[PDB]
């Protein structure tokens, strides 16, 4: 396939002109080459990541976390490696933050809600959509994620102990605590700070990884151009830990 | 003794004023009773905290993380419900943020790297930049870590399995990454988004827990009250896990 | 009455949505007891108006000009006590600003317009509408006013003699002086820097005072949720001569 | 008499460079003839103030508020009369804002203070801080005020009786209200929102006027330039009642 | 003609409202005699093109770049002598930047697409409307713009040796260079900060003026008034040689 | 000879620190070849500079106009092949700006206000102003010029025929022209936009080209590196008219 219509694409497709204050880049932030015959999906841009998509042989490289974010850097040291990788391989690497995140079709949120049971679905904030029914389940929705991430999640149960309403945000949501009005709470990355608010105001926060969660994305994405176009793809894992 | 005396005291002692920029509002948050016998020390300003404070008789609670970030928020709900502790055991709620973080006698940083082991001590940022008479084995370091707060540290060994220049900066210290340029790295809290970057700079970075390595400074502080107004105090310990 | 649906009813009914610009805090700003039982209307907030709303068993002080500016000040002296007295009596504090200032159905302007006589009413910059026949009558509008206040106005004539065309904009309207396109300006407080402009630009001006013309929101107000909930009111007046 | 040696002057005296941040346009702001034979002062820019100006033949008029806050405004309406007026007469606009209100020679609040009685002063903000020599009576230091300025003080007497400590800020001041810290504070013109945190926090407050206040700088630095160069000069009263 | 009548319609016709983020202040500068009986247009503002407006009996000059800019300069020196010449002609200065490049009708850019035979025309940024076919032309548009001008324009061929698509953009437009998507770029200013980019990107630019690329809007403003009012008008040339 | 030695010795010289405001990213841009051989001078980065530095064996390329303005872009296009170019022959890029433009011994200013005649330099801004050692004519200061560049000067000739103190500014200097205070000022580029202030204020103005006034900084600090360290270099000449 040819680079720069899987890059038109791709921009229409995720509609990344819908978030002008996202500080990544999205969209194609390293050229490669022109004629694309296999996709690799991965969660973030990397050395490591770079080097995996070299053994696979991918020429189109889609990741949630990129190498651009408003702050100019020198190409010095593990910077210049990375894009050494890149280049040696013709790598094309595409990134997609927000706009992946709140895709209704392909976006972690929405594709982690129905991997999950979630009903009714619509749109809460940025990156999500978050909150509806199931109806009435215990809190071990905690289960469903450990078994749909292979890792049992963090739970700080401050509410009920069975949630109805869910709102998801992957990655690091802790930001929109404050305005969270349901049962329960699904991100990623819990953080220190929002620890006392959490349970003095009753709410159910199930952390399941900021890697773990942002996963979903890149491959419903991959998967996609290829029902569409045929590209073959291949995941390049890299679990943090976090 | 006197509440307004012991405020004076602690805005000098902390040097207050060489921190504007600090979002926290540092120094009296509220005003208590005027007549002060006895110290509170804690990590954080929260309901479970005051609860404590006020189930013993604690007369001047000293925190780390304060109730104001330059923010301000309409009294309601558990914002309303923290005032009223407060104001029920006529408990002064005393914060410092960034000042207590770099104070070179009772600071948390500071403090640390010395329980620690570490030499030469100088400013480094809002922690603090030594090194260890002689190589050190990074297990070694992790250990004393875990002794010191009783749980064991979160290990990203990008480099040597020996190490002996350290830059410590408790909490979330993440942010300051870039800028690392020593053997060892400890701090708090670890970010997904920072993993990478870690090895691939080939960086030994120790997370030990935003909660754990931040009640030094309150403690220290207290301990110091003690001796110099003869104050006794008590430890209002709520570990986060995190 | 619920307190909750008392809020949610004044936020939509003054959809303080609509103006995010507004750096007092819209809405409830302190919580107090959850049924509500007897309203209080009050141009500003304070220890003394307070003590009044406590004296009066207020449940619901409606004021126009709240605690909070987007600076975030510390619960000490003068703050505390006031928060004390809300406390003491479970009363809840609701603010109204620009949004009072501007609603057409008891909005400060478009209220006193009508009790002086103005017509074809038509909103003129936030906080009012100004700008409407009589038609044609002296400048002893100032008397109206004046007994329509119970305190002669302060009158600067640098136009007409009789006017026509009226702009209100209670309070502190003088920063708009520039855009003022009638013949007659009325607003609260008076400039000395807006002295020689309004005469060069012969224009009048008529200064009622910014507790006098801002005392007809928080009433009418008050009224209305009594027409529409059967809530009693009361008025807490606290003239400040300015 | 030579203009561009008397503006060299005023500059370096009034040390325009070191308030680098005035909104206003310190120094010449309009150009006029060369061989300056009589001085002008007055408080404000002004038609009215600049006809006078004419009728005297004024040739350098030194103004506390100028034409110029950093906003760039059409010539047009009275604007252009006013250029008009001063390029008719070859009348020079020298205008000095905050240089003059805190001159310790001949600045607005060192002048007024040192009429008022007051000692040990000292700088504060753009005022001063100083002292009477004993415990004066409230009252008898609004009437000194009022023979200094013609006109009787407005006295908000939210302490006692007496006062020693005095904080002096011509004009509008009532924005250092929170950082006062004196048994006094005198300033220009009062304000409606700042009320109740005078009383509620015990300040004394007397305002003066901010015309009233702001004639003794200008009325100073024409008087000193007398003294240094010989040059007559006439006060250009045009009182506004503010 | 009334020429607040004159002013009202320009700024309708230009509809100035629509570039609110126009540093120059657009409409009327500086007012002059209400009566207007001829019309002067010019490039820029400056004492030459004021005193030739002057000799020419202008009354009311429109110039592309007028004296303001969000810049508050004193009125003196060669500031002071332009607003002399202004004044004692009664001239009217009327300037229009962003809106005056823009416009579909009498543009900058517009008109001067047609006088070169851009077709398909359509707006592309602010000022212009640039990209539209011939179709297929040489590179010697550059000698249709040199008769068309009377000077030879600057030619950097990047790209192609004929152009099809032609974007348009006078004055300093090479800002916009990185966004030019045709087979040639028209502006007038060349940057040497954009030569390198400009031939490795293939692209075809023609440097033809500053001041021989914007002197097509006046003319045409001019003209049209002279057609709907019957006002007679001169061009007031000072060419610069940029 | 060791590349992080000469970057450490580069960024001290150069002062790089007392620069944080500049734009551009100081110091190695670009990773390169750890044992540098041959050192590479010239005022811009560009591909046509790259393939040149890459035909002599360049290992260290210092460069004025570097890659980098804080403002992030993707590695695309042109962009890509300016860094596989750098990759290709293990080129280190060192970009200095200001710094460069400023410096005593080795800057632009500096070294060509010596060349020039000038005497008694100090700073101005980040040129200098000095003087000659008698009165000189302008078309002897604009032929010096001329021979100095290979380029005859364009000329703007507002004041005297003779002129003795100068300020020296080369690049794009006109935006310090209304601080300009000397008989002449020597830029670089011109713009139309300061014309008309030119003369209407008497200044004398000699434009010597952007490229051609900035190849003298970068020049005498490679020369300035042979001398220190015996470091062959060239210059990568690319004159770009402007």
């Not at 999906?41 to 991918?58: H, M, N, P, Q, S």
């Not at 890149?86 to 690497?93: K, Y």
Request: charged share 20%; proline share 6%.
């Amino acid at each position: 396939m040819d680079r720069d219509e899987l890059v038109r694409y791709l921009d229409a497709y995720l509609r990344i002109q819908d978030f002008p204050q996202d500080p990544s880049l999205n969209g194609l932030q390293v050229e490669g080459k022109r004629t694309v015959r296999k996709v690799g999906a991965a969660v973030d841009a990397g050395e490591a990541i770079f080097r995996k998509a070299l053994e696979e042989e991918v020429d189109f490289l889609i990741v949630h976390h990129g190498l651009f974010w408003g702050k100019p850097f020198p190409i010095v040291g593990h910077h210049k490696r990375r894009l050494e990788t890149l280049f040696q391989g013709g790598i094309n690497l595409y990134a997609a933050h927000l706009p992946l995140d709140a895709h209704e079709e392909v976006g972690n949120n929405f594709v982690l809600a129905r991997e999950l049971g979630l009903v009714d679905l619509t749109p809460w904030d940025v990156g999500v959509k978050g909150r509806f029914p199931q109806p009435t389940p215990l809190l071990q929705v905690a289960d469903r994620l450990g078994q749909l991430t292979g890792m049992q999640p963090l739970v700080h149960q401050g509410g009920l102990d069975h949630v109805e309403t869910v709102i998801l945000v992957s990655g690091s949501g802790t930001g929109l605590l404050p305005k969270v009005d349901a049962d329960l709470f699904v991100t990623g990355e819990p953080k220190h700070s929002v620890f006392h608010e959490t349970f003095e105001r009753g709410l159910n926060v199930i952390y399941a990884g900021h890697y773990d969660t942002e996963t979903f994305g890149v491959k419903a994405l991959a998967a996609h151009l290829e029902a569409r176009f045929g590209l073959p793809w291949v995941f390049l894992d890299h679990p943090t830990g976090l």
